[PDB]
Every structure is written in C-alpha cells, then in structure tokens.
Design a protein around this ligand. Structure first.
Ligand code: 65Z
Length: 135
C-alpha cells in the first residue's frame, strides 16, 4: 500500500549547495574537513521496509547509513563525527530531522519540490540549502 514517505523513496544525487560552509562552521567543523566535504557530490538511497526508513549515503568523503522509525529517537554518528540523538518525524509531507548533542540542536528538513529533493539545514542563525535530483 502507498504511504506519505513514498515521494522520498529513491536514489538522490547532490546537485547544488547554498551556505554549506557557513553551516559546517556553525557546527564546529574544521577547515580541512569543510573543504573536502564541500567538494563532494554524495548519492543517497532512501528506502522503506515496513515502518523502517533507511538513508544510505555514499561519497568520496564518507559513507553513512541510518535506519529509523518515524518519531523514535535514535543514536547517530554524523559525517563530521558528532554523536547525536536524532528524531525524524513527518510534518505533513516534510521529513523533519532534529539532532541534539552537548546541549545544541540542528534541524534538517527534507521536502519534495518539483522533481527535486530539497534539504534545509538550520543551526543557530545559519540556514543551508542542499538540492538533490534523481539518479
Ligand atoms: O550530505 C551529507 O550526507 C552530509 C550532511 N547531511 C546533512 C543533512 C542531511 C543529510 C546529511 N551533513 C554533513 C555535515 Cl553536517 C558535515 C560534513 Cl563534514 C559532511 C556532511 C555531509 C556529507 C558531505 C559530503 C560527503 C558525505 C557527507
């Protein structure tokens, strides 16, 4: 049967970024990591099996995979090596991903817009946009 998350399922390749260096800086990412991460064009497979959503990313920099159930907090190690407590929820048709660590929080929103998957990343005053197309 069909589900709301269906529009996210697929293979997505990064095409563009706005304010990513600023966002990483706000997170405390060091110079060299910012430069190397900022060059990459990662690919992410988003799949669903029952209630479990998996996000599998492959790139020249880091490979990551997370699996989760909507609304259920989980442990995540981010590409910049933060050890966070994450929760991913649907807000209408937007996936909202909150990461908490050391009393800090960042919010990552995934939305479908035209044929794209658009990510909005917010840390304190900084907003970054990452745009993906199907691969
Ligand atoms: O796009 C990502 O998967 C991703 C990412 N994103 C954040 C939004 C949701 C998906 C994961 N956040 C990053 C951060 Cl906060 C720091 C660094 Cl140093 C690298 C990344 C990368 C990243 C960047 C380049 C290659 C691999 C992962």
């Amino acid at each position: 049967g069909s589900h709301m998350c269906d529009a996210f399922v697929g293979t997505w390749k990064l095409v563009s970024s706005e304010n990513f260096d600023d966002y990483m800086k706000e997170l405390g990412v060091g110079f060299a990591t910012r430069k190397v991460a900022g060059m990459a064009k990662p690919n992410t497979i988003i799949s669903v099996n029952g209630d479990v959503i998996t996000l599998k990313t492959e790139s020249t920099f880091k490979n990551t995979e997370i699996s989760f159930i909507l609304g259920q907090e989980f442990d995540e190690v981010t590409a910049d090596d933060r050890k966070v407590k994450s929760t991913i929820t649907l807000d209408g048709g937007v996936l909202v991903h909150v990461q908490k660590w050391d009393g800090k929080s960042t919010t990552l929103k995934r939305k479908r817009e035209d044929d794209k998957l658009v990510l909005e990343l917010v840390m304190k005053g900084v907003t970054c946009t990452r745009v993906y197309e199907r691969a």
